[PDB]
Amino acid sequence: ASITSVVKTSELILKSPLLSKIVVPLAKTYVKFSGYRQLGFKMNDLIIEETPNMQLALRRLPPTESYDRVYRLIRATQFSLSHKLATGNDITKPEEDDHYLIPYILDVEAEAFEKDALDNLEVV
Amino acid sequence: ASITSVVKTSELILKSPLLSKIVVPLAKTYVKFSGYRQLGFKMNDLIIEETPNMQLALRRLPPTESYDRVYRLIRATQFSLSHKLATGNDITKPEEDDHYLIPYILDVEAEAFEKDALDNLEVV
Amino acid sequence: VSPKTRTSNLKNGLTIASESNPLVQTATVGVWIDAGSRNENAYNNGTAHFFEHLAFKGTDKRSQHQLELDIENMGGHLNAYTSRESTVYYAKSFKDDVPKSVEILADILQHSKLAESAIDREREVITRELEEVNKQYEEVVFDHLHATAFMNQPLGRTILGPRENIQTITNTELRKFITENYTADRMVLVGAGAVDHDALVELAEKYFSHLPSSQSPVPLGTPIPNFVGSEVRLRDDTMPVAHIAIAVEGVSWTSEDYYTALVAQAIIGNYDRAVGTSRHQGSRLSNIVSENNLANSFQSFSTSYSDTGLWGIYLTSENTTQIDDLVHFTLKEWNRLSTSVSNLQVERAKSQLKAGLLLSLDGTTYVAEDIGRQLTTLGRRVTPAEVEAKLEAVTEHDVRAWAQKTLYDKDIALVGLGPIEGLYDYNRIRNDMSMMRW
Amino acid sequence: FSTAEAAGVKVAAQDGQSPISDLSVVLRGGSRYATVPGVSHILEKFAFQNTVPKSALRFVRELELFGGKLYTHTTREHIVLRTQFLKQDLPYFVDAFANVLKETKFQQFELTERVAPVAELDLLKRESDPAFTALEAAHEVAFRTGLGNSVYAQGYSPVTLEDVKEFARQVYAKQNVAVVGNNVVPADLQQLVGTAFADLQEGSKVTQAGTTTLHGGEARVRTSTGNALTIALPIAEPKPVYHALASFLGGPASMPWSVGASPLAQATVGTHTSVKATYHNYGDAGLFAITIKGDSPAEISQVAHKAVQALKDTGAEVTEEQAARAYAKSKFAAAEAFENPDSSASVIGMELLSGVSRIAPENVQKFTPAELSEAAAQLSASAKPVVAAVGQVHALPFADEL
Amino acid sequence: FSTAEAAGVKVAAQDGQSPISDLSVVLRGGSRYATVPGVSHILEKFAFQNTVPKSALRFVRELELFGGKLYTHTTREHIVLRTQFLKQDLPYFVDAFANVLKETKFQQFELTERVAPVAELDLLKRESDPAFTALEAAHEVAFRTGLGNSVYAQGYSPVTLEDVKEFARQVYAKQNVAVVGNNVVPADLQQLVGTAFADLQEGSKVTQAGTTTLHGGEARVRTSTGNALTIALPIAEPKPVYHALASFLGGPASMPWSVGASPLAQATVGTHTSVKATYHNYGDAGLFAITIKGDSPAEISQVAHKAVQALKDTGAEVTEEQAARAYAKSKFAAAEAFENPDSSASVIGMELLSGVSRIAPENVQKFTPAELSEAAAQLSASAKPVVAAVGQVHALPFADEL
């Protein structure tokens, strides 16, 4: 699935009062049991990067965000190989789990999908 | 064999009156029957080039000599694949068969052999 | 809706054609001649270009210096060019300097000295031109392209001619050339901008009335070329940019497929990495090339002559290890003109061309060039309404039929210049002119 | 060009009889106003990038369906954005300009990947001509800042997204925008601009940081790609006589395979060199330049001496014939400038944005030999001569040699 | 140093009590004599390449067995080739110099692969310091040719093998060669040089093409690698008082973590900038320079104003204390210059080749406050001031501002 799809569907849910009342608590629990925060990751660190679109989005990250992401990946890799969890300041707090990459990939995808549409335009 | 050895041995023969009297006529017949001149080659075009020393010597050729060598190789390759011989001005005349590469390879080898000797020096 | 092109004739058979524009203050008047290098044989090849030099070297009345002064005093400029099938001599001036400029043009064309001293002087100037075109890579490529495509035929000859001819061109053969070719029935006096047609016709009656008529007056733009699939490789490893042209035999001015070929050309289109908009163009080749950095530029062309043409593409690239990809993807986009194109690409290209054919004519010189070209190739100026109708008549299925007989599995003429080690041999290029999957 | 006003924006249009319209937005945002070096060039290259209503990609695809073309350039005085289209497609192009001025996104990735690389290729292409470089260097010496700022973005001074965003906040405002329509019905344009540009900020007039100051000197740009030399004379009081003088001195041939009868043209005889006199009016100061290019530094040096001699000789005496020749060449130059869409737009742009009435080509003043010789005399006797050498600079002349 | 003559070659040697000798060949072949830009740098880099008796490789391997070292450099006046070795190894080093001067092979491959790349790295290392660049640019403006020629080979002006071979034919000649031996027995050196350099050509004295001419002006070198500014004043009549003035004005601190009590040092207070006054005597002309480097163009500008003021203030008054401090700092500078083997060689080299008798540090003249103030007054009121700006040149001062 494209990030675009995921973001659009999520926004439909967040609009509907009933839907949000059910989904938002479930999603928060899911994220807690997922346990990626216990390795010091942010959610966006987990997104598959081996695609032209994602490689382009990563190149557009501000250098600072890019350097910090590298450190989080290396740190998580070190926790993984040691079979340890993050402690203290290494644990990602909910307020630190920011969607730093989502705006970049949404722009990359917006252009790519517009290109696909316009490649199929028919003069009327 | 190194070009150095070939040149040195040849010079020993050319020095000796008796030796030169026998060898020079034989060498000239050999070269005539060799028939490399009938493909528009100069003798030095035939020397094996796939060694560090010879690659260095070729890089030191003046640009004009280098461009002319390329043409002779391409022209000879074309005669070879067509099973034709050179005619007219394409045939290398004896006076055109100059040792354009020998001085360069002799200098490359002189340094290489001096380096080998000096790597084995013993302080007395 | 542009003002109507007025056309009159003289008794000798000189055409006068004019398009007035009361919004401008300048006027381009000139003489378009249906004659060029193609009219030479092998012995006098270069004569037409030689004459162009001597036309500005002085006449029976004005010397070279007087000529210079007369034009300086007028305020505008004179210009000339000789091609394979067309010669042009024009004058851009102020509105009220038009009678002076017509008079000067009439003088240099009819009454040129061609003095042995001037022939001898230019013979060196032209010799130096042979060793300086070498720098204009596009021109080098296209001149070799004609030489090979029309191998040993008049269209295959260069305009400058061989070194040998330059040394042996006499005033006799110069005079003979311009007497045989520069005849009234082959000439069009053109005015664009601030010109009155009736005034221009009077000036033509005053200055161009004693022009010879040819013995056998054929219509304007009257011509057999036998295309040769072939290649010229001018490898130069010291150049950073490779220049490659690939062409097939194209269409003449009066072909029924003239507009079909223009639409096909617009489907591939042009590309230039230095232009900001080029990365967003609709053309499939443009997308492939820009995304993969395969080229600095490409330019599709459809060049027409009286009886043949060349249709193809000119590529420039610094990407020396992916020349193979560039050529591969280019020829695969040509394949799709035969196999895949539908109303989607065709209607898009027609939209783009309907405007493009009108946009091109944006100054008095461009308008004069358009009138002059059309009158000397078609015998008439085609109105925008007629052009709009001919474009509208092109269907996807005309394009497919045209590409299937003109491009698909056909011989190409190929010229490569520069670091072209990566350009494969003729067979592998020509094998991309078809698709085994189709 | 009927000058009018539509919702605070100055609109000039001239109807014609052609299927082709040119619509130009002229912005008071040229390099003399550049906050940061090269920012005007970058802003020009940022036109028709992503806007909020329409992406760069969508714009280009739709432009191709109209068969329209886009032309942009930067001067010392203006940024000019010109579209060329079929007459009937006017509303689309007005709306596209409105989107650019009101709603350009200005994204960091556009600057890094799209805008800055295109700006860099633009400059490298111009610099391939050493005469361009020489004339640019001469403005830099003569004015230092303002008119002396580089027109083009260079690598040594990087323009940031914040620089461009700030400059655009000033420039993209009702006070700095003029709309020029060639072959556009004037009443129709006013109606469209009035609806499309209504919500554009009013802003304030952009100004040159500091007064224009004149300086003499030398620039020695060492290149390996050709040789040129500019001899410039800064003018404190720009006067129209310098146009006549530029065209008189001349330099290019009016005829193929010729030298020309102009004094500067006759200075190049025996050499493969070309020469061009130009005069640049910038309202509050001017520049009179003579640029010489060639492959031989020795020949350039030779021509340079003859060029300054020619100017001195003109200061002595002009003939009536020569004065008439200057009037004719100057009237022609004025006419063709008003015809060429790029220059046309900026001429009327100046009239709208500043208040300098255009001099119609048919109203170009005839200067007597007295007035021309007096003009050349002032220039030969200038206290602040500028010389910019490009190429093998060790072999080109110096100011004190000339 | 006992000056003598051995087979037509001037030899100066001073015996000492140390195990280490320094033998230097000083050649009248510096860049003021260069025939082509950069040849004297290339000739310097060609020393100890392949000779007919001994390859470059063999020389280096044998130098290592003696534990000797090789030092070469180029100035505006000289090429200096210096070897440092144990005293007893003298005959080897004399013979090595003889091989270089008489039988250097000068092969195209050495130029392409060995000499030119080393010359290029040499220059790039020097230019890492913007102050080097500024002072080089200042000489170029001030003198144009001769002393104005670049010392170092640059990419834009390629030196060919024929250029270097021709220059070497002139330079490597008895008339242009001086031998200087530090801690070498003078009688032993004369005997060795007399046998080794006997078959060297006599040749003729190399001369500067053209007389030294002084010019004022500006150079503006755009680098992205730091900022510097030189304020130079050409001197038509070189006088020893300028050494005293250079030392007085000073600029570097004479103690760690401090600013210094010199007028130019006190001009840097509140800034991370450094400053250095320098005087260059070239016999027939001189250059007095003040170079300022720093990371801030604004701070450099600030110091540059204070620096010019300091010079003007000096032209007004110097106290007796200040004049004595100048004598002390100048005597010291002289002493350490005569000690450093690198500068020592060129000092005696100038006495041997030209004839400018050296001034012993103990004989350095004491200048009164009157003489110092007069010297500074003559500089503040110069008609030909040179200013070379390096770095963000748009933000550095101009000559007319100073």
H-run or E-run covering C384: helix C384-392
Rounded to an integer, what distance in angstroms lies between the CA atom of residue E153 and that of residue E150? 7
For chain D, say whether A66 makes contact (Cβ under 8 Å): no
Q: Which residue of E has its CA nearest to B103?
A: E107
Rounded to an integer, what distance in angstroms lies between the CA atom of residue D221 and that of residue C53? 37
Q: State the angle between helix axes of C343-359 and C396-406 in degrees (0 to 180), rounded to the nearest 10.
A: 90
Count the residues in chain D: 402
Q: Does residue C211 contact residue C185 with C-beta atoms inside 8 Å?
A: no
Q: Do B62 and E108 touch (CB under 8 A)?
A: yes
Rounded to an integer, what distance in angstroms lies between the CA atom of residue B40 and that of residue B76? 6
Rounded to an integer, what distance in angstroms lies between the CA atom of residue B97 and that of residue B31? 11
Other beta carbons within 10 Å of D248: 26
Rounded to an integer, what distance in angstroms lies between the CA atom of residue C231 and that of residue C235? 12
Q: Does residue C21 contact residue C364 with C-beta atoms inside 8 Å?
A: yes
Find all residues with CB under 8 Å of E254, minimum gap 6, and list them: E260
Q: Which of E219, E330, E237 is nearest to E288 (CA)?
A: E237
To which residue do tokens 């990371």 refer?
A: E295
Looking at the domain C6-208, which fold is it?
Cytochrome Bc1 Complex; Chain A, domain 1 (3.30.830)
To which residue do tokens 């190399």 refer?
A: E206
For chain C, say whether D256 makes contact (Cβ under 8 Å): yes
Please tell me which of the candidates E57, E109, E112 has its beta carbon nearest to residue B115: E57
To which residue do tokens 């060449």 refer?
A: D329
* Rg from Cα positions in chain A: 18
Q: Which of D166, D194, D164 is nearest to D179 (CA)?
A: D194
Enumerate the β-bridge partners of residue C233: C416
Distance of CA A100 to the CA centre of its chain: 8
Rounded to an integer, what distance in angstroms lies between the CA atom of residue E100 and that of residue B107? 19
Which three-class secondary structure string do you get for E75-107? CCCCEEEEEEEEHHHHHHHHHHHHHHHHHECCC
Residue type, E37: P
Q: Do A60 and D55 touch (CB under 8 A)?
A: no
Please tell me which of the candidates E55, E58, E109 has its beta carbon nearest to residue B60: E109
Please tell me which of the candidates C3, C74, C364 has its beta carbon nearest to residue D328: C74
Enumerate the β-bridge partners of residue D81: D25, D72
* Rg from Cα positions in chain C: 23
Q: Which residue of D has its CA nearest to E144?
A: D394
Q: Does residue D217 contact residue D258 with C-beta atoms inside 8 Å?
A: no
Structural tokens at position B39: 């493909």
Residue type, E232: A
Could you give the 3-state DSSP secondary structure of residue E260? coil
For chain B, say whether E55 makes contact (Cβ under 8 Å): yes
Structural tokens at position E147: 């002393």
Structural tokens at position E370: 């009157």
Cβ burial of C31 (10 Å; 0-12, 13-18, 19+) is: buried
Please give the span between the terminal C-alpha atoms of chain D, in angstroms, as a whole number: 45
Q: Which of E191, E121, E176, E105 is nearest to E153 (CA)?
A: E121
Q: How far is A59 from chain C (nearest CA, A)?
A: 16
Other beta carbons within 10 Å of C428: 12
What DSSP line would sit under C5-69, residue for residue?
A: -EEEE-SS--EEEEEE-TT-SEEEEEEEES--GGGS-SSSTTHHHHHHHHTTS-BSSS-HHHHHH
Q: How far is A60 from chain D (nearest CA, A)?
A: 6
Is C52 annotated in the active site?
A: yes
Q: At how many Å resolution was this determined?
A: 2.0
H-run or E-run covering E24: strand E20-27
Please give the span between the terminal C-alpha atoms of chain B, in angstroms, as a whole number: 32
For chain E, say whether B62 makes contact (Cβ under 8 Å): yes
The correct answer on CATH 3.30.500.10 for the domain covering E2-197 is no
Q: Which of C52, C85, C333, C369 is catalytic?
A: C52
The domains spanning E2-197 and E217-401 adopt the same CATH topology:
yes
Q: Can you give the residue ranges of every domain in chain E? A: 2-197, 217-401
B36 phi and psi angles, rounded to 5 deg? -65, -25
Torsion from C-alpha of E277, E278, E279, E285, nearest 10 degrees: -100
For chain C, say whether D92 makes contact (Cβ under 8 Å): no
What DSSP line would sit under D211-233, residue for residue?
A: ------EEEEE--SS-EEEEEEE
Enumerate the β-bridge partners of residue C94: C26
Find all residues with CB under 8 Å of E248, minimum gap 6, and list them: E262, E263, E314, E318, E322, E323, E325, E326, E329, E372
Q: Do C343 and A122 touch (CB under 8 A)?
A: yes
Distances (CA, A) of C247 to A76, C83, C336, C409, D144: 58, 19, 16, 13, 52
Distance of CA D284 to the CA centre of its chain: 16
To which residue do tokens 């394409």 refer?
A: B90
Cβ burial of D322 (10 Å; 0-12, 13-18, 19+) is: buried
For chain E, say whether D210 makes contact (Cβ under 8 Å): no
Rounded to an integer, what distance in angstroms lies between the CA atom of residue E289 and that of residue E277? 6
Q: Do chains A and C touch (3 or more CB pairs under 8 A)?
A: yes
Strands C187-193 and E2-6, bridge-based pairing: unpaired
Residue type, C211: L
Q: Does residue C346 contact residue C395 with C-beta atoms inside 8 Å?
A: yes
Q: Which residue of D has its CA nearest to A122?
A: D65
Enumerate the β-bridge partners of residue D83: D23, D70
- DSSP code of C232? E
Q: Does residue D35 contact residue D168 with C-beta atoms inside 8 Å?
A: no
Cα four-point dihedral sign E102, E106, E110, E116: positive
What DSSP line would sit under C48-66, residue for residue?
A: HHHHHHHTTS-BSSS-HHH
Count Cβ–Cβ pairs < 8 Å, chain A vs chain C: 12
To which residue do tokens 């030092």 refer?
A: E71
- DSSP code of D104? B
Rounded to an integer, what distance in angstroms lies between the CA atom of residue C357 and that of residue C381? 13
Residues of C in contact with D260 (CB under 8 A): 68, 72
What DSSP line would sit under E131-183, residue for residue?
A: HHHHHHHHHHHHHSSGGGS-SS--TTSPPPHHHHHHHHHHHSSGGGEEEEEET
Rounded to an integer, what distance in angstroms lies between the CA atom of residue E365 and that of residue C174? 86
Matching CATH number, D217-401, of 3.40.50.2000, 3.30.830.10, 3.30.450.30, 2.40.160.20: 3.30.830.10
Q: Does residue C49 contact residue C37 with C-beta atoms inside 8 Å?
A: yes
Structural tokens at position E359: 């001034």
Enumerate the β-bridge partners of residue D13: D2, D181
Which three-class secondary structure string do you get for A57-93? HHHCCCHHHHHHHHHHHHHHHHHHHHCCCCCHHHCCC
Please give the span between the terminal C-alpha atoms of chain A, in angstroms, as a whole number: 32
Q: Does residue C407 contact residue C334 with C-beta atoms inside 8 Å?
A: yes
Q: What is the largest CA-CA distance in chain A?
A: 63
H-run or E-run covering E196: helix E186-196
To which residue do tokens 């009435």 refer?
A: D357
Rounded to an integer, what distance in angstroms lies between the CA atom of residue C231 and that of residue C228? 9
- DSSP code of D51? B
Q: Does residue D318 contact residue D248 with C-beta atoms inside 8 Å?
A: yes
Q: Which of B7, B97, B116, B111 is nearest to B46 (CA)?
A: B97
For chain D, say whether E224 makes contact (Cβ under 8 Å): yes
Q: Which residue of D has its CA nearest to C128?
A: D272
Give residue A75's domain range. Answer: 1-124
Distance of CA E243 to the CA centre of its chain: 15
Residues of C in contact with D336 (CB under 8 A): 26, 92
Q: Does residue E172 contact residue E201 with C-beta atoms inside 8 Å?
A: yes
Experimental method: cryo-EM
Q: Do C92 and D336 touch (CB under 8 A)?
A: yes
Q: Do C282 and A122 touch (CB under 8 A)?
A: no
For chain B, say whether E107 makes contact (Cβ under 8 Å): yes
For chain E, say whether B21 makes contact (Cβ under 8 Å): no
Edge-to-edge strand ranges of the sheet holding E79-86: E2-6, E9-14, E177-182, E20-27, E79-86, E69-74
Strands E9-14 and E2-6, bridge-based pairing: antiparallel
Q: Do C94 and D18 touch (CB under 8 A)?
A: no
Q: How far is A63 from chain D (nearest CA, A)?
A: 12
What DSSP line would sit under E223-252, residue for residue?
A: -SS-EEEEEEEEESS--THHHHHHHHH--S
Cα four-point dihedral sign A32, A38, A39, A45: positive
Total domains present in chain B = 1
Enumerate the β-bridge partners of residue E273: E294
Q: Does residue E227 contact residue E205 with C-beta atoms inside 8 Å?
A: no
| Contacts of E45-48 spanning 24+ positions with Cβ under 8 A | E45/E72, E45/E115, E45/E116, E45/E118, E45/E119, E45/E122, E46/E104, E46/E106, E46/E110, E46/E111, E46/E115, E46/E164, E46/E168, E47/E72, E47/E79, E47/E81, E47/E100, E47/E104, E48/E72, E48/E81, E48/E96, E48/E100
Q: Which of C371, C367, C254, C248 is nearest to C312 (CA)?
A: C248
Distances (CA, A) of D221 to C292, D119, D388, E200, E315: 36, 21, 8, 43, 36
What DSSP line would sit under D67-88, residue for residue?
A: T-EEEEEE-SS-EEEEEEEEGG
Please tell me which of the candidates D55, D107, D112 has its beta carbon nearest to residue A114: D55
For chain E, say whether D383 makes contact (Cβ under 8 Å): no
Rounded to an integer, what distance in angstroms lies between the CA atom of residue C202 and that of residue C209? 10
Count the residues in chain C: 438
Could you give the 3-state DSSP secondary structure of residue D361? helix
Q: What is the largest CA-CA distance in chain C?
A: 70
Distances (CA, A) of D158 to A59, D26, D76, D111, E393: 19, 25, 19, 11, 14
Count Cβ–Cβ pairs < 8 Å, chain A vs chain D: 20
Q: How many distinct helices (H) and strands (E) make up chain B?
A: 5, 0
Rounded to an integer, what distance in angstroms lies between the CA atom of residue E400 and that of residue E231? 12
Half-sphere exposure of D359 (CA within 13 A, CB side): 15
E289 phi and psi angles, rounded to 5 deg? -125, 150
Q: Which of E246, E210, E234, E228 is nearest to E333 (CA)?
A: E246
Distances (CA, A) of A46 to A28, A43, A70, A102: 17, 6, 12, 12
Find all residues with CB under 8 Å of D361, minimum gap 6, and list them: C25, D331, D332, D334, D335, D338
Please tell me which of the candidates D156, D215, D394 has its beta carbon nearest to residue E222: D156
Count the residues in chain A: 124
